[PDB]
Design a protein around this nucleic acid. Sequence first.
DNA 1: AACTATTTATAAG
DNA 2: TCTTATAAATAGT
Lengths: 90, 90
Amino acid sequence: GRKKIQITRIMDERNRQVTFTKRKFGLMKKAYELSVLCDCEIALIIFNSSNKLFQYASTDMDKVLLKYTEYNEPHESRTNSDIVEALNKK
Amino acid sequence: GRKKIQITRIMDERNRQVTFTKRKFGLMKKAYELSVLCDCEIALIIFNSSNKLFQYASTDMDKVLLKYTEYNEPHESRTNSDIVEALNKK
DNA sequence: AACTATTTATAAG
DNA sequence: TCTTATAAATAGT
């Protein structure tokens, strides 16, 4: 956008609340497209600072969660650190 | 990118596999940033066309899924259709 | 495994 | 492998 930003908690309770809403949609949109382009099933679960729930699922969310729990092989399992680290590599 | 593309299953088994890998990271990156910018907890579950698993979580993924299962209020619960619709509105 | 032709999202071959 | 001014993602070569 107009300015570049440093990933860090927006201290401003409002721009935070606004950015959340905006990006959340972007996130879901992407998820949507990825889901579709590549014939994959996606589930996305979000909890805002106030522990309120927002969820997207390409299909049948609980169906996906169920598959998940039953999975028994190793697999890509990233976390925030994994991500920051992968980033710094570039 | 160089060309605009229509959201639909990449029929080319290869460009599909490639695009999947690329965008998946983009997805996680975003999720990462959202998680951080806005102090929210995020869990992302992906299954490729071949039923293999990929997951990101801002923190303790199972902790998040657990919260989810226990939630009992109505909440934003989007799905692909909800998304396409919302798009066409623009 | 790069590259790269205001940064589509988002902050004020 | 809500409006632009700008950053950040990415299709394709």
